[PDB]
Write a protein that binds this ligand. Sequence first.
Ligand SMILES: Nc1ncnc2c1ncn2[C@@H]1O[C@H](COP(=O)(O)OP(=O)(O)OC[C@H]2O[C@@H](O)[C@H](O)[C@@H]2O)[C@@H](O)[C@H]1O
Length: 184
Amino acid sequence: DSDIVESYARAAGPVHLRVRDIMDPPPGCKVVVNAANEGLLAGSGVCGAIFANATPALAADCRRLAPCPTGEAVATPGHGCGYTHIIHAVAPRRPRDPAALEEGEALLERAYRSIVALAAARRWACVACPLLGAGVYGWSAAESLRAALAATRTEPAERVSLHICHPDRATLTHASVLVPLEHH
Ligand SMILES: Nc1ncnc2c1ncn2[C@@H]1O[C@H](COP(=O)(O)OP(=O)(O)OC[C@H]2O[C@@H](O)[C@H](O)[C@@H]2O)[C@@H](O)[C@H]1O
């Protein structure tokens, strides 16, 4: 646990900020989150890395399940990507000029809430998760972390610990300063 920048206490469960590749499972995380699109298609970034390491049956399962509405999440088997299951969660694209912005912050928080409720229903205690929406969907790491730390305030039926993984130390340490700074 030397990769942990900070650990936050939240109703859902502890949220750990971890310097590591999403494809390098944290100890005890058998379930990973895909930062997915509504069509559940392979993309770049985290989605690319998960599909890159999986069988064709994953695309087949997604064909059966698509679309996953923005703000929602849906599970599939992992198909050899290194995890037993994948939670495909769909972040909104960041609205470029409000008021859609405040609407989109709620939808980003909802995506994280949807991950937690899903994991709780499957009795998955730990989940490895990227910073939803912080890649091509335009959010910053701090915006995505702030959303995760808000979403986890909603108490779930069973505790779920989010291990948030990003391979760049500076991105996470920076985000860990900006989150409290907003409230300062
Ligand atoms: N291997 C990786 N491991 C951990 N974090 C990663 C990795 N690759 C990217 N990240 C980071 O995770 C966050 C999410 O970035 P994206 O992967 O681009 O996901 P998102 O912004 O939500 O956009 C989703 C869209 O992009 C496609 O990958 C996906 O199919 C969908 O269309 C960003 O912080 C990104 O830098």
